[PDB]
Scaffold this active site. Structure first.
Site, PDB file in Angstrom:
ATOM      1  N   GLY A  27     -27.675 -27.831  33.476  1.00  0.00           N
ATOM      2  CA  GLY A  27     -28.871 -28.043  33.593  1.00  0.00           C
ATOM      3  C   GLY A  27     -29.663 -27.501  32.535  1.00  0.00           C
ATOM      4  O   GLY A  27     -29.273 -26.418  32.273  1.00  0.00           O
ATOM      5  N   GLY A  32     -35.186 -22.717  30.155  1.00  0.00           N
ATOM      6  CA  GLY A  32     -33.520 -22.197  29.984  1.00  0.00           C
ATOM      7  C   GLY A  32     -32.575 -23.366  30.329  1.00  0.00           C
ATOM      8  O   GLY A  32     -32.948 -24.410  30.190  1.00  0.00           O
ATOM      9  N   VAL A  34     -28.458 -23.659  32.191  1.00  0.00           N
ATOM     10  CA  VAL A  34     -27.405 -22.975  33.268  1.00  0.00           C
ATOM     11  C   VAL A  34     -26.069 -23.798  32.578  1.00  0.00           C
ATOM     12  O   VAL A  34     -26.052 -24.778  32.513  1.00  0.00           O
ATOM     13  CB  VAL A  34     -27.955 -23.152  34.495  1.00  0.00           C
ATOM     14  CG1 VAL A  34     -26.837 -22.383  35.276  1.00  0.00           C
ATOM     15  CG2 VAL A  34     -29.088 -22.605  34.919  1.00  0.00           C
ATOM     16  N   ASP A 159     -33.784 -21.156  42.836  1.00  0.00           N
ATOM     17  CA  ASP A 159     -34.791 -21.617  42.186  1.00  0.00           C
ATOM     18  C   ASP A 159     -34.561 -21.777  40.773  1.00  0.00           C
ATOM     19  O   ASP A 159     -34.364 -20.841  39.911  1.00  0.00           O
ATOM     20  CB  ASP A 159     -36.274 -20.982  42.138  1.00  0.00           C
ATOM     21  CG  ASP A 159     -37.303 -21.858  41.979  1.00  0.00           C
ATOM     22  OD1 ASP A 159     -37.240 -22.895  41.279  1.00  0.00           O
ATOM     23  OD2 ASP A 159     -38.509 -21.501  42.177  1.00  0.00           O
TER      24      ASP A 159
HETATM   25  C1  LIG Z   1     -39.714 -17.229  36.747  1.00  0.00           C
HETATM   26  C2  LIG Z   1     -38.747 -17.430  38.077  1.00  0.00           C
HETATM   27  C3  LIG Z   1     -38.978 -16.399  39.076  1.00  0.00           C
HETATM   28  C4  LIG Z   1     -38.067 -16.498  40.154  1.00  0.00           C
HETATM   29  C5  LIG Z   1     -37.122 -17.485  40.330  1.00  0.00           C
HETATM   30  N1  LIG Z   1     -36.362 -17.377  41.312  1.00  0.00           N
HETATM   31  N2  LIG Z   1     -36.752 -17.214  42.858  1.00  0.00           N
HETATM   32  C6  LIG Z   1     -35.914 -17.114  43.472  1.00  0.00           C
HETATM   33  C7  LIG Z   1     -35.839 -17.240  45.171  1.00  0.00           C
HETATM   34  C8  LIG Z   1     -37.371 -17.297  45.463  1.00  0.00           C
HETATM   35  C9  LIG Z   1     -35.221 -18.348  45.671  1.00  0.00           C
HETATM   36  C10 LIG Z   1     -35.342 -15.589  45.448  1.00  0.00           C
HETATM   37  C11 LIG Z   1     -34.590 -17.433  42.678  1.00  0.00           C
HETATM   38  C12 LIG Z   1     -34.692 -17.474  41.518  1.00  0.00           C
HETATM   39  N3  LIG Z   1     -34.076 -17.569  40.405  1.00  0.00           N
HETATM   40  C13 LIG Z   1     -32.740 -18.422  40.470  1.00  0.00           C
HETATM   41  O1  LIG Z   1     -32.469 -19.052  41.484  1.00  0.00           O
HETATM   42  N4  LIG Z   1     -32.249 -18.626  39.172  1.00  0.00           N
HETATM   43  C14 LIG Z   1     -31.019 -19.158  39.079  1.00  0.00           C
HETATM   44  C15 LIG Z   1     -31.253 -20.611  39.473  1.00  0.00           C
HETATM   45  C16 LIG Z   1     -29.839 -21.350  39.229  1.00  0.00           C
HETATM   46  C17 LIG Z   1     -28.785 -20.797  38.946  1.00  0.00           C
HETATM   47  O2  LIG Z   1     -27.559 -21.907  38.673  1.00  0.00           O
HETATM   48  C18 LIG Z   1     -27.729 -22.974  39.118  1.00  0.00           C
HETATM   49  C19 LIG Z   1     -26.368 -23.495  39.362  1.00  0.00           C
HETATM   50  N5  LIG Z   1     -25.817 -23.265  40.750  1.00  0.00           N
HETATM   51  C20 LIG Z   1     -25.774 -21.679  41.025  1.00  0.00           C
HETATM   52  C21 LIG Z   1     -25.191 -21.385  42.334  1.00  0.00           C
HETATM   53  O3  LIG Z   1     -23.829 -22.190  42.327  1.00  0.00           O
HETATM   54  C22 LIG Z   1     -23.768 -23.489  41.982  1.00  0.00           C
HETATM   55  C23 LIG Z   1     -24.387 -23.845  40.769  1.00  0.00           C
HETATM   56  C24 LIG Z   1     -28.671 -19.653  38.449  1.00  0.00           C
HETATM   57  C25 LIG Z   1     -27.476 -18.744  37.909  1.00  0.00           C
HETATM   58  C26 LIG Z   1     -27.757 -17.689  37.403  1.00  0.00           C
HETATM   59  C27 LIG Z   1     -28.573 -16.859  37.834  1.00  0.00           C
HETATM   60  C28 LIG Z   1     -29.700 -17.142  38.243  1.00  0.00           C
HETATM   61  C29 LIG Z   1     -29.775 -18.667  38.409  1.00  0.00           C
HETATM   62  C30 LIG Z   1     -37.021 -18.470  39.284  1.00  0.00           C
HETATM   63  C31 LIG Z   1     -37.752 -18.418  37.994  1.00  0.00           C
END
Ligand SMILES: Cc1ccc(-n2nc(C(C)(C)C)cc2NC(=O)Nc2ccc(OCCN3CCOCC3)c3ccccc23)cc1
Length: 336
Positions: A27, A32, A34, A159
């Site tokens: 995506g 950004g 992924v 997220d």
């Molecule tokens: C500015 C900002 C601030 C905070 C966030 N934020 N807030 C949350 C909570 C609230 C749910 C804790 C979580 C997040 N950030 C995320 O959830 N970030 C990520 C999204 C999708 C990913 O991969 C998607 C692919 N997927 C991963 C799981 O396995 C299947 C494939 C990711 C792979 C690696 C690393 C990080 C990822 C986001 C942005």
């Protein structure tokens, strides 16, 4: 410092440690991209998120710090956790890029769609949200594309946060936040859960509005127009005058809308999908609802360690947010 290697995927350069291989795009959006990959240090599938130009602006830099801080704190079975974080940079002076890693778990509508599986899936979402809320975080973005599920029907909340099979955020948004009605609480996320659970029961998006006006029209067709007691809580005058101009709608009988569903499922949806956010059920109250009797264990529904958000108040320059982020990259310790 591992050996890095470079490659280009969809016009985006990826420079990653050699342990991460077979990068395949998942995506992409303004903030950004992924990729899925294989980690040859473990033999496991991972996902790697590369932030786009993380220190190009104040918004970018503060978002970058916000996400890394929060992901480092999240330690719950139903929320994403951080396996690794890395940068090809060898010094603060050339720190320009941030990469985040999680285990690859992959909704898209878990093998069968029984009432049993809807129970387990919504149970895990609520369990993860009880944890997130206990850290004084509101998700605000819950939707099926922000849920990860595996073949055993285990689920994590995440997220993407990228500003990206089409799934519109507005379809799952609570009306008070979508239309700036009033000061809103954590139960905006419970509205989103109700929308997700409804779709799992019926096979279709509950409120597929094409814009914010149509979205509100679809919502009020189910839950009815606000009455005088709730209108008085809508402190936005423009929103109040608009709602009062509309043709009034009665609340629908949910047992007829969701005909055939478990009556406990219908009752829970009735408590989640209410316009008045002072009356909407919370995640902890929902976990105790009889729909979840075969999963609820009040001794295994944990809350978060306290989470310091004092940085949110600070008004800092790009290079200051950059330095704080670099500190957090350097101090990361991978889980066991
Ligand atoms: C500015 C900002 C601030 C905070 C966030 N934020 N807030 C949350 C909570 C609230 C749910 C804790 C979580 C997040 N950030 C995320 O959830 N970030 C990520 C999204 C999708 C990913 O991969 C998607 C692919 N997927 C991963 C799981 O396995 C299947 C494939 C990711 C792979 C690696 C690393 C990080 C990822 C986001 C942005």
């Amino acid at each position: 410092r591992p050996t890095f290697y470079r490659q280009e995927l969809n016009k985006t350069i990826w420079e990653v440690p050699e342990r991460y291989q077979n990068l395949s795009p998942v995506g992409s959006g303004a903030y950004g991209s992924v990729c899925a990959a294989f980690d040859t240090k473990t033999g496991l599938r991972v996902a790697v998120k590369k932030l786009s130009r993380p220190f190009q602006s104040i918004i970018h830099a503060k978002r970058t710090y916000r996400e890394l801080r929060l992901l480092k704190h999240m330690k719950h079975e139903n929320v994403i956790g951080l396996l690794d974080v890395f940068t090809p940079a060898r010094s603060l002076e050339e720190f320009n890029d941030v990469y985040l890693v999680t285990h690859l778990m992959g909704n898209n509508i878990c093998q069968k769609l029984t009432d049993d599986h809807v129970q387990f899936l919504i149970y895990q979402i609520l369990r993860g949200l009880k944890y997130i809320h206990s850290a004084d975080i509101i998700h605000r973005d819950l939707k099926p594309s922000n849920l990860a599920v595996n073949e055993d029907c285990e689920l994590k909340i995440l997220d993407f946060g990228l500003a990206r099979g089409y799934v519109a955020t507005r379809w799952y948004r609570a009306p008070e936040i979508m239309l700036n009605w009033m000061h809103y609480n954590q139960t905006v996320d419970i509205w989103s859960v109700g929308c997700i659970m409804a779709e799992l029961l019926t096979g279709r998006t509950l409120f597929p509005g094409t814009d914010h006006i149509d979205q509100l029209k679809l919502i009020l067709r189910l839950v009815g127009t606000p009455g005088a007691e709730l209108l008085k809580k809508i402190s936005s005058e423009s929103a109040r005058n608009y709602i009062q101009s509309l043709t009034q709608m009665p609340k629908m009988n949910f047992a007829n809308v969701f005909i055939g569903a478990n009556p406990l499922a219908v009752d829970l949806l009735e408590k989640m999908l209410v316009l008045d956010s002072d009356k909407r059920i919370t995640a902890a109250q929902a976990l105790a609802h009889a729909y979840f009797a075969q999963y609820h264990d009040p001794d295994d529904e944990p809350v978060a360690d306290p989470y310091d958000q004092s940085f949110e108040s600070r008004d800092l320059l790009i290079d200051e947010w950059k330095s704080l982020t670099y500190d957090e990259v350097i101090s990361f310790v991978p889980p066991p």
